[PDB]
Design a protein around this nucleic acid. Structure first.
Ligand code: NA
Ligand SMILES: [Zn+2]
Ligand SMILES: [Zn+2]
Ligand SMILES: [Zn+2]
Ligand SMILES: [Zn+2]
Ligand SMILES: [Zn+2]
Ligand SMILES: [Zn+2]
Ligand SMILES: [Zn+2]
Length: 197
DNA sequence: CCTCACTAGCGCCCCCTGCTGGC
DNA sequence: GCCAGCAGGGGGCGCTAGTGAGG
């Protein structure tokens, strides 16, 4: 095989070896004109132009969804149709379509929290979980109830609000040991831990 | 030396679950 | 108890930068 010897890359073919050498140049000739982004190859620029237009030539056969690139279609089929999960955990039976989700799962086994909050001691196992935690410091309430226009910090909190205040005839939870009617399952658990040990 | 799939990595957002603490 | 705040374990998509290989 051929050896790049700059990043220790091996490739049996001679055309892909020369293509890999162009990866080190870090110069982007092809420039979009709608925006300022520049690209290395025409194929990436053409895909970028398709994202502007919304043109999605890669159409899934099993549903009415389409994607700009063939890679997105492959991931979609694994998520929705084939249910192939190539990346498997070595400590349990969990498997994921993508690497980052397996790595997120692995940090649950180990307890690693590599994403530190810059305002307090909190640290998360997910980058996006840190963003959600930031709303505790900024006081942001991105979600709004479409009925009473109340605002909430989490989407799931808003959904519970709609169920418990705008939905009629919702089954409630009855305490097994006393005649107490409780609307929320978690509040029933609190009631059991308080007046029933 | 084309061409299109497949891979790796970044980001986005939501889901459900279940608890906490002010009221 | 009611209620919004809030964290933990997850799924699915948007977009880019590469690689593998039939042709
Ligand atoms: Na396993
Ligand atoms: Zn190299
Ligand atoms: Zn553009
Ligand atoms: Zn599909
Ligand atoms: Zn595991
Ligand atoms: Zn913080
Ligand atoms: Zn409401
Ligand atoms: Zn009771």
């Amino acid at each position: 095989t051929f050896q790049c010897e700059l990043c220790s890359y091996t490739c049996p073919r001679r055309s892909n070896l020369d293509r890999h050498m162009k990866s080190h140049t870090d110069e982007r000739p092809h420039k979009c004109h709608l925006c300022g982004r520049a690209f290395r190859t025409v194929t990436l620029l053409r895909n970028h132009l398709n994202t502007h237009t919304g043109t999605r030539p890669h159409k899934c056969p099993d549903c009415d969804m389409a994607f700009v690139t063939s890679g997105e279609l492959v991931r979609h089929r694994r998520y929705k149709h084939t249910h192939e999960k190539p990346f498997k955990c070595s400590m349990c039976d969990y498997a994921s379509v993508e690497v980052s989700k397996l790595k997120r799962h692995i940090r649950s086994h180990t307890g690693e929290r590599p994403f530190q909050c810059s305002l307090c001691s909190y640290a998360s196992r997910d980058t996006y979980k840190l963003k959600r935690h930031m709303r505790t410091h900024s006081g942001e309430k991105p979600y709004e109830c479409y009925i009473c226009h109340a605002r909430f910090t989490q989407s799931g909190t808003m959904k519970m609000h709609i169920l418990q205040k705008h939905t009629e005839n919702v089954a409630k939870f009855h305490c097994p040991h006393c005649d107490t009617v409780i609307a929320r399952k978690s509040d029933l658990g609190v009631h059991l831990r308080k007046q029933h040990s």
